[PDB]
mmCIF file of all heavy atoms in Angstrom:
data_model
loop_
_atom_site.group_PDB
_atom_site.id
_atom_site.type_symbol
_atom_site.label_atom_id
_atom_site.label_comp_id
_atom_site.label_asym_id
_atom_site.label_seq_id
_atom_site.Cartn_x
_atom_site.Cartn_y
_atom_site.Cartn_z
ATOM 1 N N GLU A 13 6.629 -4.378 -4.060
ATOM 2 C CA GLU A 13 8.034 -4.750 -4.222
ATOM 3 C C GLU A 13 8.866 -3.886 -3.280
ATOM 4 O O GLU A 13 9.511 -2.909 -3.670
ATOM 5 C CB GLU A 13 8.456 -4.593 -5.674
ATOM 6 C CG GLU A 13 7.634 -5.442 -6.626
ATOM 7 C CD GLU A 13 7.760 -4.983 -8.057
ATOM 8 O OE1 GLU A 13 7.546 -3.781 -8.304
ATOM 9 O OE2 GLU A 13 8.063 -5.818 -8.933
ATOM 10 N N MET A 14 8.849 -4.277 -2.012
ATOM 11 C CA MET A 14 9.399 -3.478 -0.928
ATOM 12 C C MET A 14 9.360 -4.320 0.340
ATOM 13 O O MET A 14 8.577 -5.270 0.443
ATOM 14 C CB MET A 14 8.607 -2.179 -0.770
ATOM 15 C CG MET A 14 7.363 -2.324 0.074
ATOM 16 S SD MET A 14 6.445 -0.781 0.079
ATOM 17 C CE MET A 14 5.981 -0.687 -1.646
ATOM 18 N N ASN A 15 10.231 -3.987 1.294
ATOM 19 C CA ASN A 15 10.281 -4.728 2.546
ATOM 20 C C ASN A 15 9.270 -4.163 3.543
ATOM 21 O O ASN A 15 8.476 -3.273 3.229
ATOM 22 C CB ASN A 15 11.704 -4.739 3.117
ATOM 23 C CG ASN A 15 12.222 -3.350 3.476
ATOM 24 O OD1 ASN A 15 11.461 -2.397 3.638
ATOM 25 N ND2 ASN A 15 13.538 -3.241 3.614
ATOM 26 N N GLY A 16 9.299 -4.691 4.766
ATOM 27 C CA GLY A 16 8.327 -4.274 5.762
ATOM 28 C C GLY A 16 8.530 -2.846 6.228
ATOM 29 O O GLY A 16 7.561 -2.130 6.498
ATOM 30 N N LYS A 17 9.790 -2.414 6.341
ATOM 31 C CA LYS A 17 10.071 -1.023 6.682
ATOM 32 C C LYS A 17 9.402 -0.074 5.699
ATOM 33 O O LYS A 17 8.865 0.968 6.093
ATOM 34 C CB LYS A 17 11.581 -0.778 6.707
ATOM 35 C CG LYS A 17 12.255 -1.136 8.021
ATOM 36 C CD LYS A 17 13.733 -0.772 7.995
ATOM 37 N N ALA A 18 9.416 -0.425 4.411
ATOM 38 C CA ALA A 18 8.795 0.431 3.408
ATOM 39 C C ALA A 18 7.275 0.360 3.480
ATOM 40 O O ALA A 18 6.593 1.369 3.265
ATOM 41 C CB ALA A 18 9.291 0.046 2.016
ATOM 42 N N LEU A 19 6.724 -0.824 3.772
ATOM 43 C CA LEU A 19 5.279 -0.956 3.950
ATOM 44 C C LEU A 19 4.747 0.062 4.950
ATOM 45 O O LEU A 19 3.674 0.642 4.749
ATOM 46 C CB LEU A 19 4.929 -2.372 4.416
ATOM 47 C CG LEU A 19 4.560 -3.441 3.386
ATOM 48 C CD1 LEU A 19 3.977 -4.667 4.081
ATOM 49 C CD2 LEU A 19 3.586 -2.892 2.354
ATOM 50 N N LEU A 20 5.495 0.299 6.028
ATOM 51 C CA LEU A 20 5.024 1.160 7.104
ATOM 52 C C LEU A 20 4.962 2.627 6.699
ATOM 53 O O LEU A 20 4.310 3.418 7.387
ATOM 54 C CB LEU A 20 5.925 1.000 8.328
ATOM 55 C CG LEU A 20 5.920 -0.404 8.934
ATOM 56 C CD1 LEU A 20 6.924 -0.520 10.075
ATOM 57 C CD2 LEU A 20 4.524 -0.793 9.387
ATOM 58 N N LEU A 21 5.630 3.010 5.610
ATOM 59 C CA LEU A 21 5.594 4.388 5.140
ATOM 60 C C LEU A 21 4.415 4.676 4.222
ATOM 61 O O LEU A 21 4.057 5.846 4.049
ATOM 62 C CB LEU A 21 6.897 4.736 4.411
ATOM 63 C CG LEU A 21 8.163 4.841 5.264
ATOM 64 C CD1 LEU A 21 9.277 5.531 4.489
ATOM 65 C CD2 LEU A 21 7.878 5.579 6.562
ATOM 66 N N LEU A 22 3.811 3.648 3.633
ATOM 67 C CA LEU A 22 2.692 3.857 2.726
ATOM 68 C C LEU A 22 1.453 4.310 3.487
ATOM 69 O O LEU A 22 1.196 3.870 4.611
ATOM 70 C CB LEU A 22 2.380 2.575 1.951
ATOM 71 C CG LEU A 22 3.456 1.998 1.029
ATOM 72 C CD1 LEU A 22 2.933 0.761 0.307
ATOM 73 C CD2 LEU A 22 3.915 3.049 0.028
ATOM 74 N N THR A 23 0.686 5.200 2.868
ATOM 75 C CA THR A 23 -0.606 5.587 3.405
ATOM 76 C C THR A 23 -1.672 4.588 2.958
ATOM 77 O O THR A 23 -1.429 3.710 2.127
ATOM 78 C CB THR A 23 -0.969 7.002 2.957
ATOM 79 O OG1 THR A 23 -1.214 7.008 1.546
ATOM 80 C CG2 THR A 23 0.168 7.969 3.270
ATOM 81 N N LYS A 24 -2.873 4.720 3.527
ATOM 82 C CA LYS A 24 -3.974 3.859 3.103
ATOM 83 C C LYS A 24 -4.331 4.104 1.643
ATOM 84 O O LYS A 24 -4.700 3.170 0.919
ATOM 85 C CB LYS A 24 -5.193 4.074 4.002
ATOM 86 C CG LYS A 24 -6.464 3.408 3.485
ATOM 87 C CD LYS A 24 -7.061 2.442 4.493
ATOM 88 C CE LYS A 24 -7.924 3.161 5.514
ATOM 89 N NZ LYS A 24 -8.794 2.216 6.271
ATOM 90 N N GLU A 25 -4.220 5.354 1.189
ATOM 91 C CA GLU A 25 -4.461 5.651 -0.218
ATOM 92 C C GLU A 25 -3.449 4.943 -1.110
ATOM 93 O O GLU A 25 -3.785 4.504 -2.216
ATOM 94 C CB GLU A 25 -4.421 7.162 -0.448
ATOM 95 N N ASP A 26 -2.202 4.822 -0.645
ATOM 96 C CA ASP A 26 -1.201 4.072 -1.398
ATOM 97 C C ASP A 26 -1.583 2.601 -1.497
ATOM 98 O O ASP A 26 -1.438 1.984 -2.558
ATOM 99 C CB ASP A 26 0.174 4.225 -0.745
ATOM 100 C CG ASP A 26 0.671 5.655 -0.761
ATOM 101 O OD1 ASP A 26 0.251 6.415 -1.656
ATOM 102 O OD2 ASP A 26 1.478 6.021 0.119
ATOM 103 N N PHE A 27 -2.071 2.023 -0.398
ATOM 104 C CA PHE A 27 -2.547 0.645 -0.433
ATOM 105 C C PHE A 27 -3.704 0.495 -1.411
ATOM 106 O O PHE A 27 -3.731 -0.437 -2.223
ATOM 107 C CB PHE A 27 -2.964 0.200 0.968
ATOM 108 C CG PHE A 27 -1.851 -0.404 1.772
ATOM 109 C CD1 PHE A 27 -0.868 0.393 2.333
ATOM 110 C CD2 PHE A 27 -1.794 -1.772 1.971
ATOM 111 C CE1 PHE A 27 0.155 -0.166 3.077
ATOM 112 C CE2 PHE A 27 -0.777 -2.337 2.713
ATOM 113 C CZ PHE A 27 0.200 -1.534 3.266
ATOM 114 N N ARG A 28 -4.671 1.414 -1.349
ATOM 115 C CA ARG A 28 -5.821 1.346 -2.245
ATOM 116 C C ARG A 28 -5.394 1.486 -3.700
ATOM 117 O O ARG A 28 -5.944 0.817 -4.584
ATOM 118 C CB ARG A 28 -6.831 2.430 -1.874
ATOM 119 C CG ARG A 28 -7.687 2.093 -0.666
ATOM 120 C CD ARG A 28 -9.000 2.856 -0.695
ATOM 121 N NE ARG A 28 -9.585 2.994 0.634
ATOM 122 C CZ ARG A 28 -9.334 3.997 1.464
ATOM 123 N NH1 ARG A 28 -8.513 4.979 1.132
ATOM 124 N NH2 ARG A 28 -9.923 4.015 2.657
ATOM 125 N N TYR A 29 -4.417 2.355 -3.968
ATOM 126 C CA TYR A 29 -3.907 2.507 -5.327
ATOM 127 C C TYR A 29 -3.259 1.217 -5.814
ATOM 128 O O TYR A 29 -3.523 0.757 -6.931
ATOM 129 C CB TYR A 29 -2.911 3.667 -5.382
ATOM 130 C CG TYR A 29 -2.389 3.976 -6.769
ATOM 131 C CD1 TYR A 29 -3.072 4.841 -7.613
ATOM 132 C CD2 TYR A 29 -1.202 3.415 -7.227
ATOM 133 C CE1 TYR A 29 -2.594 5.130 -8.882
ATOM 134 C CE2 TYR A 29 -0.716 3.697 -8.493
ATOM 135 C CZ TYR A 29 -1.417 4.556 -9.316
ATOM 136 O OH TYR A 29 -0.937 4.841 -10.574
ATOM 137 N N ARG A 30 -2.408 0.614 -4.982
ATOM 138 C CA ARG A 30 -1.695 -0.590 -5.397
ATOM 139 C C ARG A 30 -2.619 -1.798 -5.473
ATOM 140 O O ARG A 30 -2.434 -2.662 -6.338
ATOM 141 C CB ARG A 30 -0.532 -0.860 -4.442
ATOM 142 C CG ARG A 30 0.679 0.018 -4.708
ATOM 143 C CD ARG A 30 1.639 0.024 -3.532
ATOM 144 N NE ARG A 30 2.826 0.822 -3.815
ATOM 145 C CZ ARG A 30 3.899 0.368 -4.448
ATOM 146 N NH1 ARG A 30 3.973 -0.883 -4.874
ATOM 147 N NH2 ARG A 30 4.924 1.188 -4.659
ATOM 148 N N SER A 31 -3.615 -1.878 -4.592
ATOM 149 C CA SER A 31 -4.568 -2.987 -4.572
ATOM 150 C C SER A 31 -5.974 -2.410 -4.492
ATOM 151 O O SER A 31 -6.507 -2.194 -3.395
ATOM 152 C CB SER A 31 -4.288 -3.937 -3.409
ATOM 153 O OG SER A 31 -5.218 -5.007 -3.387
ATOM 154 N N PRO A 32 -6.607 -2.144 -5.637
ATOM 155 C CA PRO A 32 -7.976 -1.605 -5.603
ATOM 156 C C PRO A 32 -8.985 -2.551 -4.977
ATOM 157 O O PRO A 32 -9.985 -2.087 -4.415
ATOM 158 C CB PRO A 32 -8.290 -1.348 -7.085
ATOM 159 C CG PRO A 32 -6.959 -1.305 -7.765
ATOM 160 C CD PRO A 32 -6.094 -2.262 -7.010
ATOM 161 N N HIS A 33 -8.755 -3.864 -5.052
ATOM 162 C CA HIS A 33 -9.707 -4.820 -4.496
ATOM 163 C C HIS A 33 -9.475 -5.080 -3.013
ATOM 164 O O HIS A 33 -10.426 -5.406 -2.293
ATOM 165 C CB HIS A 33 -9.638 -6.148 -5.258
ATOM 166 C CG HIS A 33 -10.031 -6.049 -6.700
ATOM 167 N ND1 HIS A 33 -9.111 -6.096 -7.726
ATOM 168 C CD2 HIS A 33 -11.244 -5.919 -7.289
ATOM 169 C CE1 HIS A 33 -9.739 -5.993 -8.883
ATOM 170 N NE2 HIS A 33 -11.034 -5.883 -8.646
ATOM 171 N N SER A 34 -8.237 -4.944 -2.535
ATOM 172 C CA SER A 34 -7.906 -5.393 -1.190
ATOM 173 C C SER A 34 -7.025 -4.428 -0.409
ATOM 174 O O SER A 34 -6.646 -4.756 0.721
ATOM 175 C CB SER A 34 -7.210 -6.764 -1.256
ATOM 176 O OG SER A 34 -8.105 -7.768 -1.702
ATOM 177 N N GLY A 35 -6.699 -3.256 -0.960
ATOM 178 C CA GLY A 35 -5.709 -2.393 -0.330
ATOM 179 C C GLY A 35 -6.101 -1.928 1.061
ATOM 180 O O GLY A 35 -5.283 -1.947 1.983
ATOM 181 N N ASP A 36 -7.352 -1.492 1.231
ATOM 182 C CA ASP A 36 -7.798 -1.037 2.546
ATOM 183 C C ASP A 36 -7.811 -2.180 3.551
ATOM 184 O O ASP A 36 -7.510 -1.984 4.734
ATOM 185 C CB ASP A 36 -9.186 -0.410 2.440
ATOM 186 C CG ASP A 36 -10.166 -1.300 1.703
ATOM 187 O OD1 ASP A 36 -9.803 -2.452 1.382
ATOM 188 O OD2 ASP A 36 -11.296 -0.845 1.435
#
């Protein structure tokens, strides 16, 4: 729940946390 500017600040660990199946 964030725009593209915010997406660019997340780390890969943040992606993995938010999406355990597909974050990486």
Side-chain angles (χ1 to χ4, degrees), residues 13-16 18-24 26-36:
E13 301 163 308
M14 84 185 65
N15 63 19
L19 267 192
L20 297 175
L21 291 195
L22 298 182
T23 68
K24 170 123 83 165
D26 297 334
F27 271 75
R28 282 204 203 89
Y29 184 87
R30 281 163 178 275
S31 180
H33 297 106
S34 293
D36 50 6

